[PDB]
Design a protein around this ligand. Structure first.
Ligand SMILES: Nc1nc2c(ncn2[C@H]2C[C@H](O)[C@@H](COP(=O)(O)OP(=O)(O)OP(=O)(O)O)O2)c(=O)[nH]1
Ligand SMILES: Nc1nc2c(ncn2[C@H]2C[C@H](O)[C@@H](COP(=O)(O)OP(=O)(O)OP(=O)(O)O)O2)c(=O)[nH]1
Ligand SMILES: Nc1nc2c(ncn2[C@H]2C[C@H](O)[C@@H](COP(=O)(O)OP(=O)(O)OP(=O)(O)O)O2)c(=O)[nH]1
Ligand SMILES: Nc1nc2c(ncn2[C@H]2C[C@H](O)[C@@H](COP(=O)(O)OP(=O)(O)OP(=O)(O)O)O2)c(=O)[nH]1
Ligand SMILES: [Mg+2]
Ligand SMILES: [Mg+2]
Lengths: 611, 623
């Protein structure tokens, strides 16, 4: 089906009562007196479309002559997919597009727009016009750099960004400070100053410490039981995953050291791993960030380096880099037993241009960030609706069938997104750092593992073409989509449905269609208690096996789904490895070891009932 | 007596074992290994004398063939008064002088020193070579400025400075923030971020909020145990003391308002005072800062404006200003029933040059601070050992006699301090803002109240003369001297002795522990050693001589401690010194456990009528 025809299928499907509540609550603009300037999703779609279309003002391919026509065309296409909720950008784009702009320019009808109208939108974007979810700032080993980072956290947090740092540069607790006296207090103590700052600004962060840091044990125990409540904590593994797996298998020792300290110590890697696992078992923190694996696929490494991710894991970013995200609802592409790939390719091309255009109309609080974004132009296109699509396709999330499907789907998306980036580099100009990247200096560089799709060879040649032309250093991610999937009335990112029937502060729509009412109306009671179909007798085996929820799916099937998607994603993936309440610490270690052998770039575990 | 003769009486008296522990503990310099580079007070005095004498390189009145002789002469005099412990600068001068300099230059015999040796010292002072105790920075009403200030606090604290701010620019909690629909959190929420920052960096501060800020009540209670545990807190009074007294006397109302909020409130000034008094009665916070009174006597006002003090309250500073302090031990100037004014004058002269010289060798971590200090050259010359001096002269602290003597002594110090500033302004150049100060644009400007001394008219004359030459915007203070009075083995600041005897413990390898009885040295000298041994027991038990049978009445009357002296007599002493001090004074108004909140109010009311620039109260037994 053509995308315009898919759009006509979805454009007039109204957001649910639940979606409308969230939108009124957080998304619709209000005036200086709390009066609504927007009252429907279509108002949001119009403002967002128009502001992002404005980027086409800077398109060197257009003559001043056609610009108005071309702009209005892009506004029109952006508006239609958005109103149809086939693609939605990350929250900050929805909150903050048009901040600074005359109200009378933001919702005016497109046929009435003039070239001067777009120019004035472009020029009136203010300091709050911040449209990206993801940030990483360094924290250098000096009081000066530490507290400059604290200020950067406050400023990014204030404008609506989530920020992450690797704190490893900070010399360990007790290290000599060539001051008068006395001693360095170490990374963890300074992370409390970050927490306290953000707790007041927000009156959601990421903190990583590398496995070979001498204060790693204190770090692992840092949210145990003063927390640290605004931090997600991950242990960083800057070295090769293979190397750590070997060391664990051999019961080796890790040397803890720091370049600006005499503090040195040896620890058994197994002991340290177990300590990580025990705490994750108890409370879900800390996670694992496979930084080396991220740098393995980083086009700008080693002259730039990924040291941290954003709070949710899904983008590894170099220092001062930010990334804006957006997600395609794949559940809307179900068509009579198949994914309508015709319409999908069209949308992926549109989604990539929109995300790239967001960069040009984005305003950041810190010039170093403006600069890092301009040079790399990293994007984060992902998907949501995945689990709901599997229900429509009558495929069990816990099956090799689902994972082979997932991999081909992501490969197809990756192929058309990178092809779009080639196209946009031709039209608009390459990302400034193309010349020094592995797309250019290397042969056969591919920013992900592949190995589970028929599309590989096609991907490999598109990657070779991007030696010459390429708008973006990387393009793909899979985010949590915690709010935008609610707006889209669909499942979140790549996660299975957590529950089929609930009451968020609500019976799945696909289940409501496939399940005979009466079988439904009976069971909807004990579905809500119990939280699964599994042990409800007199529901058909076929419904049971397809309509699985997160805790129907064992930890290994969670991890293998993440691997299958990660093979064709150039940034990272947000995925929780749900574990049953009866899972032991050994079960958790086994997840870590399997994770080390797969292509996953990080791990988050959550044991049911643990918190 | 000539100062040289006084120096020779003291130069070979080594610090008490008590002092030496303090020195080893934190003053003596160590190498990267943890090894001692200094092991005697004499070593510290060489280093410091040498480093501060280096500033004479820059003296535009020395011809090149003069310079090396002149510098060695200043190093020698500096060394002697330090070694003798007649003058000691604030701790950061003693911690940090010479940091960055090659160890082979800091202690070498002076008769091996060359001009190039001094030039190398000047060049190699590093970024940690911070010699001043006292700082103020502004905290403006934006996230950017608030966190820029958190960063300055961390940097200033790291290098050994104590910093304060007025947080009144921050719009009250619940205020409108433009272009968003979220509200401002308020000054007290941000002060938590500053307390967190500094609790890690130090793993006190001064915070002031003005009495008319709408969050003033929250602030008054901010260290109420239900904590800003690294802050001293004071309430700011930027209006005239007179205005506030009148309002209180009328049972009037104050309007709380902010220029960037629509939040207004009317509160009875008496109810606000009582809230303050009750909290201070419970816990010692908050104190009162009479900022308007400080601005009354600030020579740069209103071009520049004092909005805060340092943590101990004794310097009022404008935005980004810092001050270096030091103190003369005046108990050492006792001579046959009189204060030796001839030797004291000479030492004021030396001490003011030292302190002004510290500015030249000081390194600050922030641009705007270097600038503010160069432009003003504020100093804080003070005294310690004043209580022990009264003991020697047999004057009771809690008496008009003591207060009249304090005023005259402070007046004499002020006169010769400001005179030296005059002489130094001709010799080295005036402070840059002389031209726009009240020393220039006015007639009869005096930066303190006076009214309690025979020296008043000569003081007027010198202030008139400094319309022409003046090296420093202000010169004097009285500081707590919590460490350096320990070092000099003398009483702290202008304060009375807290106790005359107590047990201190000397840590030993094989024992331990151990009991070591200290008795005030002047008490030891005056009281019968036979009497002493009898009473010693009850004195440590009771904390005073007052109710001990059969100690002579005159001894009980002279040898008073802090708690023998009633709150008004503490306050009037502060008033006597403040009259002849251009900066402020550190003074705790001690109160008996049996004082009430009404008694605390009465101290505040009397404070409003005297010339004091702020108030701190501490009720015995409260914390
Ligand atoms: N908690 C605490 N940590 C400090 C202090 N001074 C330094 N540190 C920690 C902060 C940094 O992680 C590390 C280095 O800090 P700085 O570079 O500011 O110290 P500095 O440059 O004086 O000495 P350096 O030449 O770098 O060893 O030491 C301090 O006063 N308090
Ligand atoms: N799941 C969920 N998220 C919420 C809720 N309220 C606020 N949020 C937050 C979660 C995210 O930090 C923020 C933005 O949501 P999005 O769906 O745009 O972003 P996503 O969850 O993909 O996270 P990210 O883009 O990595 O920051 O909204 C809620 O009630 N449920
Ligand atoms: N806790 C908290 N306070 C804030 C936040 N934003 C602003 N404030 C407080 C900090 C300052 O006291 C005051 C003003 O903040 P800024 O100058 O950074 O805000 P902005 O320039 O955006 O708006 P303005 O024109 O000053 O109203 O409001 C925030 O997001 N969280
Ligand atoms: N470690 C330690 N520090 C102390 C003690 N008593 C006071 N201090 C701190 C607070 C002072 O700001 C700092 C330096 O001692 P000083 O005698 O030079 O300063 P002072 O008490 O006059 O306070 P100020 O110069 O206003 O900061 O020493 C103590 O018993 N132990
Ligand atoms: Mg450093
Ligand atoms: Mg502002």
């Amino acid at each position: 089906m053509k995308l315009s025809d898919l759009i006509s299928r979805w454009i007039d499907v109204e957001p649910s009562k639940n979606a409308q509540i969230i939108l009124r609550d957080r998304y619709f603009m209000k005036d200086l007196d709390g009066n609504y300037l927007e009252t429907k999703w279509e108002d949001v779609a119009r403002r967002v479309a128009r502001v992002v279309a404005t980027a086409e003002l800077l398109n060197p391919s257009y003559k001043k002559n056609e610009k108005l026509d071309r702009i209005k065309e892009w506004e029109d296409i952006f508006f239609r997919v958005l109103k149809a909720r086939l693609f939605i950008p990350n929250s900050p784009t929805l909150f903050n597009a048009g901040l600074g702009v005359k109200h009378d320019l933001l919702w005016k009808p497109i046929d009435q727009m003039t070239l001067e109208d777009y120019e004035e939108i472009y020029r009136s974007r203010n300091h709050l016009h911040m449209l990206s979810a993801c940030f990483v700032v360094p924290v250098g080993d000096s009081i000066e750099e530490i507290f400059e980072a604290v200020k950067e956290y406050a400023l990014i947090t204030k404008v609506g960004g989530g920020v992450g740092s690797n704190f490893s540069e900070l010399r360990p607790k007790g290290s000599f400070v060539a001051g008068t006296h006395g001693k360095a207090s170490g990374p963890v103590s300074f992370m409390h100053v970050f927490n306290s700052a953000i707790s007041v600004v927000k009156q959601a962060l990421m903190g990583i410490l590398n496995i070979n840091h001498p204060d790693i044990e204190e770090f692992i125990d840092a949210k145990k039981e003063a927390v640290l409540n605004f931090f997600n904590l991950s242990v960083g593994f800057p070295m090769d995953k293979k190397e750590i797996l070997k060391l664990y298998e051999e019961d080796g020792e890790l040397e803890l050291s720091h370049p600006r300290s005499t503090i040195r110590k040896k620890v058994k890697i197994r002991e340290l791993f177990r300590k990580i696992a025990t705490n994750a078992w108890k409370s879900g923190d800390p996670g694992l960030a496979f930084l080396g694996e991220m740098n393995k696929y980083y086009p700008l490494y080693p002259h730039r380096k990924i040291n941290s991710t954003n709070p949710c894991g899904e983008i590894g970013l170099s220092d001062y880099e930010a990334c804006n995200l957006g997600s395609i609802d794949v559940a809307k592409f179900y068509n009579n037993g198949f994914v309508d790939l015709e319409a999908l390719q069209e949308l992926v091309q549109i989604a990539v241009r929109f995300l790239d255009n967001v960069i040009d109309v984005n305003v950041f609080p810190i010039d170093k960030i403006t600069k890092a974004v301009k040079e790399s132009r990293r994007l984060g296109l992902g998907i949501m609706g995945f689990a709901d699509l599997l229900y429509k396709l009558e495929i069990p999330y816990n099956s090799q069938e689902a994972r082979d499907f997932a991999a081909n789907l992501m490969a197809f998306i990756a192929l058309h997104a990178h092809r779009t980036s080639y196209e946009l580099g031709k039209e608009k100009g390459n990302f400034p750092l193309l010349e020094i990247s592995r797309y250019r200096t290397e042969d056969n560089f591919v920013p992900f593992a592949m190995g589970m799709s028929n599309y590989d060879d096609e991907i490999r040649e598109v990657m070779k073409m991007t030696k010459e032309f390429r708008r973006n250093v990387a393009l793909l991610t899979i985010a949590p989509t915690g709010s935008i999937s609610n707006i889209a009335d669909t499942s979140s990112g790549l996660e299975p449905n957590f529950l089929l029937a609930y009451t968020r502060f609500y019976v799945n729509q696909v289940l409501r269609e496939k399940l005979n009412p009466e079988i439904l109306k009976r069971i909807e009671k004990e579905l809500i208690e119990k939280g699964s179909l599994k042990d409800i007798p007199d529901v058909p085996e076929k419904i049971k096996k397809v309509f699985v929820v997160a805790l129907d799916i064992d930890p290994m099937d969670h991890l293998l789904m993440q691997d299958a998607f990660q093979r064709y994603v150039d940034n990272n993936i947000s995925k929780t490895i749900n574990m049953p309440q009866s899972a032991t610490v050994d079960d958790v270690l086994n997840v870590y070891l399997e994770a080390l052998r797969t292509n996953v770039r990080g791990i988050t575990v959550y044991r049911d009932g643990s918190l």
